[PDB]
Every structure is written in structure tokens, then in C-alpha cells.
Amino acid sequence: ATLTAKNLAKAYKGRRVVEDVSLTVNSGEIVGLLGPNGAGKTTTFYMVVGIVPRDAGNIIIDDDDISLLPLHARARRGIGYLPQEASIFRRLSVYDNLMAVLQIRDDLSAEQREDRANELMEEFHIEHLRDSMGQSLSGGERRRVEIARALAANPKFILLDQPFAGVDPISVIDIKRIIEHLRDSGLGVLITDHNVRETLAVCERAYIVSQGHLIAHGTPTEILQDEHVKRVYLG
Amino acid sequence: ATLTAKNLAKAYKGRRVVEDVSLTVNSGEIVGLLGPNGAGKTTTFYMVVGIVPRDAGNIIIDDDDISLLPLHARARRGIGYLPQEASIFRRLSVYDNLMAVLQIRDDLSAEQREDRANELMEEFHIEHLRDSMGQSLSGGERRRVEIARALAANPKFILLDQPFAGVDPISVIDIKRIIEHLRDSGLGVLITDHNVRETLAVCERAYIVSQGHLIAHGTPTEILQDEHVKRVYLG
Numbered sequence: 001a002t003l004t005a006k007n008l009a010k011a012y013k014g015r016r017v018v019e020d021v022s023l024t025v026n027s028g029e030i031v032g033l034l035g036p037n038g039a040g041k042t043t044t045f046y047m048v049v050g051i052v053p054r055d056a057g058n059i060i061i062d063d064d065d066i067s068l069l070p071l072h073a074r075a076r077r078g079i080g081y082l083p084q085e086a087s088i089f090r091r092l093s094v095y096d097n098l099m100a101v102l103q104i105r106d107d108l109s110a111e112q113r114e115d116r117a118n119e120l121m122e123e124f125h126i127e128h129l130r131d132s133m134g135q136s137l138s139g140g141e142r143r144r145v146e147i148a149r150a151l152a153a154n155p156k157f158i159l160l161d162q163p164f165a166g167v168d169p170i171s172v173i174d175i176k177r178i179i180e181h182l183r184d185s186g187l188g189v190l191i192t193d194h195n196v197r198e199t200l201a202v203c204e205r206a207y208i209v210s211q212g213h214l215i216a217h218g219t220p221t222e223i224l225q226d227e228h229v230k231r232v233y234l235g
Numbered sequence: 236a237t238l239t240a241k242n243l244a245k246a247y248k249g250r251r252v253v254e255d256v257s258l259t260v261n262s263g264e265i266v267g268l269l270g271p272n273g274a275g276k277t278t279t280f281y282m283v284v285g286i287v288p289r290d291a292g293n294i295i296i297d298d299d300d301i302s303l304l305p306l307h308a309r310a311r312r313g314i315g316y317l318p319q320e321a322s323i324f325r326r327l328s329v330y331d332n333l334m335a336v337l338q339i340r341d342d343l344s345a346e347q348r349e350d351r352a353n354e355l356m357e358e359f360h361i362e363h364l365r366d367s368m369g370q371s372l373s374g375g376e377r378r379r380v381e382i383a384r385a386l387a388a389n390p391k392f393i394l395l396d397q398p399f400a401g402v403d404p405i406s407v408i409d410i411k412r413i414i415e416h417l418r419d420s421g422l423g424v425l426i427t428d429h430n431v432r433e434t435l436a437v438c439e440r441a442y443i444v445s446q447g448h449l450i451a452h453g454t455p456t457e458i459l460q461d462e463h464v465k466r467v468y469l470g
């Protein structure tokens with residue numbers, strides 16, 4: 001499958017924070033979107049997911065233009081999303097958080113949902129926080145739960161907005177391994193994070209945006225060796 | 236001046252998440268507190284600042300045990316704090332956010348507060364977001380504003396909980412430079428962040444905690460070469 005964004009544009013009160021951004025992600029591929037603070041990364045993710053209306057552009061899966069589909073419909077088509085901001089339910093336990101998302105799984109019976117929640121807790125090493133309320137979790141614990149919640153939806157394409165934020169080095173390795181397994185399982189992954197080295201390590205190719213514009217695209221080595229990228233982003 | 240925490244301990248429902256942690260930070264020194272997710276770092280910061288009551292231990296500045304002082308009193312004694320979680324006022328502009336914190340500055344006249352806010356916006360490269368509401372900021376923009384807010388309080392000791400979270404590489408350099416300037420100006424700095432290399436680069440020494448216990452203390456090189464730290468934290 002192929003997820004394509006064409007000529008995306010977003011302005012806020014006349015300020016064009018995204019301008020003519022096009023990107024593509026395929027099944028079984030991990031693709032990066034990186035760039036300076038305020039460059040328009042999250043806004044771009046928002047327009048793909050359907051969180052904010054676009055001023056221009058198109059969203060397409062395979063042959064179908066899904067630009068007119070609302071958030072819920074795009075999700076049903078297979079678009080998944082891990083927000084940068086906290087997304088956990090504060091009063092619910094880790095287990096109840098997972099079971100809540102799993103309620104959307106029409107392909108799973110009641111018992112299958114319960115098995116999946118236990119599987120996810122095992123996979124993300126959070127079984128010991130099973131009954132812990134979301135609001136009681138440390139930053140890194142919460143991030144694992146939020147990633148697990150995103151996966152519980154069983155997306156075809158997953159947009160990961162800063163999956164490494166607040167996560168320790170061993171957990172970065174674990175999450176990288178999980179992302180690679182998603183890719184091997186046939187998911188397309190679009191990832192943005194400010195841990196450049198760790199993000200480029202998992203990506204096959206990456207887009208670099210700056211001030212709402214795409215300034216570079218290529219393999220990690222090509223990106224790292226790009227003089228313009230070095231100047232305005234890598235430093 | 237010297238800030239000292241002695242034998243700090245915190246339990247939640249019988250689970251000891253911090254146990255007998257002691258640390259010291261001096262004026263003109265940058266000290267790190269690092270370790271795995273859930274190790275008790277933020278909880279330790281909370282007990283020093285006065286955000287959560289300690290089960291045991293003491294907080295001391297120079298000769299004065301300030302363990303009995305509430306949050307506001309400890310702040311007046313010079314303890315400053317940048318939370319890990321969002322701390323910006325969502326509906327207020329960047330400028331109004333700064334002016335709000337600066338209202339606590341008894342040492343500054345009305346006009347002096349306004350000058351300081353403009354200085355801070357210049358220093359943190361956020362002048363262009365002057366009238367932007369906190370809720371409209373990107374993640375990295377918001378972090379700069381939050382760091383600026385923490386500094387506006389003019390603390391003697393500043394506890395920085397993940398100052399690099401969501402920040403781009405050039406901004407990491409800028410913030411490092413600002414931290415070093417704080418140190419040269421006589422502040423003591425206690426910093427925790429999950430960007431290990433960048434954090435150790437600014438620290439003179441660091442404490443490593445794991446499962447509520449201090450497992451190592453030393454210079455950055457000593458930490459990085461510690462086999463136990465490599466095993467349970469660095470990977």
C-alpha cells in the first residue's frame with residue numbers, strides 16, 4: 001500500500017507554516033520527517049491524520065483520494081497516529097487505557113482484545129504498571145503506554161510524533177526494534193523525532209523541512225552530508 | 236552557596252520509588268542526575284522543590300535546614316525549577332507568560348520587568364512569537380519559553396527537568412550555552428535529561444539513579460566507563 005500527501009499547505013492568520021509539502025510512505029518502509037523547531041512537522045502530521053483542515057493539498061491511499069474523509073474515516077482506512085503531546089487517559093490504569101483503544105477493533109472478539117492488551121503490556125515491558133493510573137506514570141513509562149495505545153488500533157500506516165521523547169537509552173533500542181518489527185509486518189511508518197541519530201538509524205529515507213518548506217530528501221547518509229541541512233538544522 | 240539533599244525517601248502505596256538519595260550542588264557548578272525511566276529522578280526533584288512531601292530526608296541551603304519550608308519559601312530562598320511537563324499558560328502570549336513570572340521579582344521596578352522580558356525573548360530567540368498564545372506554540376518553541384520562564388524567577392539554584400525535550404540540535408547548543416552562562420554567573424544547576432551525550436557534555440559531575448537508588452557518581456567520563464551504569468542504563 002501507498003500513503004501519499006500532495007502539495008499540503010497550512011496557514012495560521014496569514015502565516016504559512018506549511019507550504020507545498022509532498023511526501024510518500026509505503027508499506028514495509030520507515031520514512032523520516034525531520035527539521036528545526038517550528039518547521040511545520042506536527043502540522044503536516046495533523047493534515048494527514050485529519051486533525052486540522054488543510055488549506056490545500058491531497059491525501060491519497062493507493063488509488064483513493066481520501067482528502068474529504070474525516071478523521072474517523074481515515075483511521076478506518078488504516079491511518080494511525082501517536083501524538084507528540086500526552087494522549088494517555090489520566091484516571092485510567094495502563095490496562096484500562098489499552099482496553100479502551102482495543103474497543104475499536106471490530107476484528108477481535110472480547111477475549112481476543114484482552115489477550116492483545118496483555119500481549120502489548122508484555123511487549124512494551126509495562127506489565128508491572130498494569131493497574132497504575134496514567135497520571136501516576138513517569139514520563140518514560142507514559143510514552144511506552146502511549147506507543148502501545150497507538151499500535152492497539154492496528155493501523156496500516158503509523159505516524160509517530162516523537163516516540164523517543166523522555167525515553168531512556170535501553171527503551172530507545174526496544175522501541176527501535178518494535179518499529180522495525182512493524183515494518184517487517186507490513187506497516188508503513190512515518191516518524192519524526194528530535195533524536196536525529198536514533199531516528200535516521202531506523203529510516204530508509206527522510207524528508208527535511210524548514211520554515212514550512214521541504215529542503216531535502218534522501219537516505220540518512222545523504223541527509224547528514226547535505227550542506228544546507230547541516231547549516232539550518234544539524235548545526 | 237551549597238544546596239544539599241540528605242537521605243531523601245519517597246514511597247507511593249508502599250512502593251519505595253526513591254530510597255536514601257543524597258546529592259549536592261554548588262554555586263557555579265552544573266551537576267547531572269540521570270538514569271533509567273521510573274528511577275525516581277522527577278520525584279527527587281519534587282522533594283527538593285517542595286512539590287511532594289518527603290517520607291524522609293533533609294533539604295539544606297548552606298547552614299540552614301529548609302526541610303520545613305513550603306514551596307514558596309524555598310523558592311524565595313533561591314530554588315528554581317523547570318518542570319518536565321508543560322508549564323506555559325496556554326491562553327497567554329509569550330510576552331504575557333514572561334511578565335507573569337516577573338511579577339514575583341521584588342528586586343525589579345515595573346519598567347525593569349518589561350526590559351527583562353524583552354531581554355529574555357532576545358536571548359531565547361523568541362521575539363517573533365511575542366504575541367503568540369502558549370497553546371499555539373510548537374513543542375520546541377514552547378520549551379524555550381518554559382526555560383525562559385524558569386530563569387525569569389532569578390533562582391540561585393535551578394533544577395532543570397528535561398530542558399532538551401523536543402528541542403532541535405541548534406537549540407540544544409543555544410540552551411547549553413545559556414546553562415554555561417548561568418553557571419558563570421554563579422547559579423548552581425541540577426539537570427536531568429534523556430539526551431545523555433548532550434547532558435554529560437555540560438555537567439562537571441553526575442549522579443546515576445536506578446530503581447530509587449544511587450548507583451554511581453563521578454565525572455562524565457567516569458560515568459560513561461562504569462560497567463554497572465552501562466548495563467542498567469546506557470545499554
Ligand SMILES: Nc1ncnc2c1ncn2[C@@H]1O[C@H](COP(=O)(O)OP(=O)(O)OP(=O)(O)O)[C@@H](O)[C@H]1O
Nearest residue numbers: 012017037038039040041042043371372373374375
Ligand atoms: N493554532 C495555531 N495558531 C497559530 N500558529 C500556530 C498554531 N499551531 C502551530 N502554530 C505555529 O506553526 C508553526 C509550525 O508548528 P509545528 O507544531 O507544525 O512545528 P514542528 O515542526 O512540529 O515544531 P517542533 O519541532 O518545535 O515540535 C510553529 O511556528 C507554531 O508557532
Ligand SMILES: Nc1ncnc2c1ncn2[C@@H]1O[C@H](COP(=O)(O)OP(=O)(O)OP(=O)(O)O)[C@@H](O)[C@H]1O
Nearest residue numbers: 136137138139140247252272273274275276277278
Ligand atoms: N502519584 C504517584 N503514585 C504512584 N506511583 C507514582 C506516582 N508518581 C510517580 N510514581 C511512580 O514512581 C516512579 C518514579 O517516577 P519518577 O517520575 O520519579 O521517575 P523518573 O526517573 O523521573 O522517570 P522518567 O525518566 O521516565 O521521567 C515511577 O515508576 C512512577 O510510576
Ligand code: NA
Nearest residue numbers: 041042084374
Ligand atoms: Na512538533
Ligand code: NA
Nearest residue numbers: 139276277319
Ligand atoms: Na521524569
